[model samples]
Target chain A: LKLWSFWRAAIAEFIATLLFLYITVATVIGHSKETVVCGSVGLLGIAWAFGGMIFVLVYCTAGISGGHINPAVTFGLFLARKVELLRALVYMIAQCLGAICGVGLVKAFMKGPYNQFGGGANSVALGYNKGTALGAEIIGTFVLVYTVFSATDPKRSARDSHVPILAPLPIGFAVFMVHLATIPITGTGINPARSFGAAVIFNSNKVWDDQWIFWVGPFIGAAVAAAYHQYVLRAAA
Target chain B: LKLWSFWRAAIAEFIATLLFLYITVATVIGHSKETVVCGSVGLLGIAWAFGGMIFVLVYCTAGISGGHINPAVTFGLFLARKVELLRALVYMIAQCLGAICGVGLVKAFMKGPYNQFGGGANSVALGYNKGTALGAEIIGTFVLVYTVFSATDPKRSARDSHVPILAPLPIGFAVFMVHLATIPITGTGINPARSFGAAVIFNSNKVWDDQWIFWVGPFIGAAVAAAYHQYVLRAAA
Candidate 1:
């Protein structure tokens, strides 16, 4: 039953990731028109959408699978003993595959002319180099995962433990804050799956060459956050 | 004891509103020219600050009194049986007075010639007319109050039933969502006291003329939302 439950949760994460990527890409593609595009749902909008998508997905899947929608999150959970290594592997695979399919579906919908947005891949722009972009990604992902652990710890004090209801709210707000601060540097790729899915298909030099940083930074940050949650902040009894 | 508790909550609401308005105005005046001046945080930032402030305040005070920080919210709570009419009146009066002081402090701090930013009053801009503005306020307030009731309702199957933690989050997110969608339309005023305090003191002709809609729309929306939560959703099981 535990194994069955793990697979169920992994599949749920897969489906949720697809929905998130699809909605995010659709919003960007739909609103890219010039006249209506005076920063309509710019970085802040995209970040909020990303976080809101996660929040709603968690609510929908919290009962079925605990909703580890991000691979980095699953990795963190593994460290916390909340998830097993084999299950985490299954979740990461599903997440990446789902992301690819999501990008492909987005491409199919956009068709010919609109595909020029490079499938919304993460990359350094203007004069920013890969290292600078990597630094932003690491810092951005650190804040996100740290907040996630803090907000969702079941042991937090009752007064501060609104995490279940607020799970998506701060998660979404953190994403918004991350984008507000880092969109200029790296287009904000705190999710490795989000980065990998878009970069693999887009195959742009900037996207592929700098892709390793996205995974390394976020995964490292997630590990550190999990450690901090497990060791430093004594969970409320 | 309950009546005394209610009075304390009303006073908390007043002080919270004042602090919220004071911080919001200070950000606009102080940081509007700094690196944070990106248009992403413009109206949306202000709205989130207000929401976050209220969320933190409600977390602290909801244990004492239901934390009706806005007059419209108090009116809605009166209809919901979560609060009484007399108590609601007291809360409204405190909220309005607190808001007045909040705007007054903003005036004091920004007394120099550079304080020309309309003192944060709500009004239509970006080609929206009076009706459109009213509609936006109605819809925005409806969302805010609905989330408030649902997120804080202890009877729901939600994971976080405790008031101190869950109360502020959905309320804050609702505020952020409202700002994202309607900031361009009506400057996003879902609280009557907020609209009244700034409009009355700013003494702008347009703000005064349009202030009635701010009151009417948010109050009606809050009432409808409260009724929906109580009668339709049956949130208070």
Candidate 2:
């Protein structure tokens, strides 16, 4: 029964991640056309798309695996003692695999001659050194994780229980905020899986060399947020 | 006693409208100068600002008087039998008066040499004639009012109760979407009071000439949406 339950949760993650990526990437495509497109929908639009899609997905799957769609989020929950290590590992694997499939599908659809935009991967700019890029990633991830913690804290308000619905909205708005600040700086990599998938497929040394910043920054930020929620906020009750 | 109750509702509307204008226009002053300026937050941003502000005000005052922040919305509710005629008149007066105060405050702050742009009144531009501008306003208001009805319908879904939180999100996002499509043409006016307040003070003939379209279009759209929600969606309990 336990094994069956784990499998069900993993499958749920897969389905949710698929839908999330499909909708967000499709939005990017829909808004990328030159004449009809109004300034690329910019970072705000993309952030809202990702956040809103995740919000809907969380509502659909909250009864299942608690809706930990991102590996960083699962890791943070584990640190906070809200999730077990084994379950965290499983969720991380599911997210990484789901990301690969998601990007693969996007690549398949873009079979034309148009230049692929690193499959939407996070990376540093041309002239910036690794340290500057890492700093940007850290700050971006910190904001994203801080928002997640605040939005999910049940004790904060009666509205906390409504987090699952409002989760994507603020979180998406936060992402939009982060992008507004960091898009010109580091392409805003607040998620390692988002970076890894694009880097691996694109097979670029530039992306690989800078990939550590994505992992390090997001992990640090997520850890801090998790600790803050547990120790300072004490939201577990 | 009835007169006192009516006055309370009017006061509530005035307060809510002022709060909405204050927060949203402040967004135009700070941080807005760094990026694209006029297009920094963009049309979608403005729309979200308008809709999201309304959503929050509605939640704050829904019990007080159904929280009809817009005259058009109040008219729609009256036609639908959800609001009484006398109550609608009071709401409209409160809304218009509050809007005027909101614009006055904005003018007071923006009076120095920093007042590069004129008053933020609604007007037709980008080569769109009056008819096209009116059509866009009508369509935009229809979508907004339709969503409002569906979201607030009590018997529709247990989820509908969550509307107080979730309603603002979609309403905000819908505003963003409408602005994305229509900003270049009509400067995206789905609110007459928004236009009228700024236009009356700016005393621009162009703004005055086009003012009717903003009022007429949104009212027509709101009434149509109310009818559609009631008749087509069968929203009654």
Candidate 3:
């Protein structure tokens, strides 16, 4: 691990998170419009945008940085000892900045919709309160982080491992599945950088009203997932 | 290679299709309701059901059967000399039977809603005639089949390959992206097995009327993709 310098992996995470958030958050913002076919791609399409962008960006950056676009993910890997603290911290900084830039682009090009419709910021939705919303984020992030650990598990990735699990596919699908179940509750903020970036761009009282849930829920979930996988699942495997 | 016994590979395709269709078609039909937190799973969620199921099933079966749950995929791989004629034929049969059983489950449990809502059958939507619908299938299948061939190309899968590409992720994303683009047109039937199963379950005249396009277009697109990859791209890689 290099110290006291801008790392290459940090750069990879920056660009990857930027592209991931740009495509996904922008899709979420534009997806509410009537011009899109079949009710603006609806909730399902928004899930696809998030999942598919993760697949593409992760595939592109996996070899370079392990593609922890989410800060919670970086922290999880930190707990698992897959990444050093210095690198993880740098990755988190780069990721948050990248996310900010991503949502900023969405705001610049479509100001009217960005303001009127909302800037894809995560928030509590119908039939849910702060507690339920926090639980949703926890469960969602847990699914995502657990899959990340499973997919990248060295034993599962070996040549002779019964099957080769593609790290990106499961990780992306985990996000997709979580969104499918949680979108209506809190717009699915499994990634702290994603939620933070959108909140910063939207900068509305409404966006900030319940912002802490996204951060706290995901961090706790990631920690739990790391412990579960590293201690329980990996021990048996 | 076996003459009379049910091949393990065939069984893999059978169970994979059973699962791939069960999850995806069920999601599509159930997706149009208002019960979901935010007005049903929506178009985006339906895509996730398809794409996410594909990712999971493929990851599970990619080793045992090459995970060709789609008839178009099996045909494309056969043309590329990736599978023998006998294996391809058996795989296709297994896939089709599995699809039938999968949709059968969906119908049996939810006959009222299944009939009231109509099976998530593929058909030309507004402003598109049969010709355009066929065009949509052709392009959509081309994207899917092309990505399959490219992702699993031996050159890309080689030990010395520059970067590890998650084969299932791209293949699944191809399905996800195609659905995003073409769901409004032909309901996005890049997989003939998927279309055939839904049509059989619905057994509607409208579903049957444009069914040929789903079969013909995907086959033609797969053929084109096979030729392009085998003759042009493989020569270099």
Ranking by DockQ: 3, 1, 2
Better candidate by lDDT, 2 or 3:
3
State the RMSD for candidate 1.
9.2
Candidate topping lDDT = 3
User: How many residue pairs of model 1 clash at the backbone?
Assistant: 0
For all predicted structures, in order, the TM-scores are 0.56, 0.51, 0.55
lDDT of 1 by residue, B104-190 (tens): 898886765214666678888744467757766775687677667655645432112122223666576566656655555566789
lDDT of 3 by residue, A24-79 (tens): 87787787655634556677778778887888887777766777789998898788
lDDT value for model 3: 0.75
When 1 and 2 are scored with lDDT, the better candidate is: 1
Model 1: lDDT of residue A63? 45
Off by over 4 Å in 1: A1-41, A53-237, B1-3, B31-44, B113-115, B153-166
Classify candidate 3 by CAPRI docking class.
Answer: incorrect
Better of 1 and 2 by DockQ: 1
Instruction: Write out fnat for all predictions, comma-separated.
Output: 0.03, 0.00, 0.23
- What DockQ does candidate 1 have relative to the true complex? 0.05
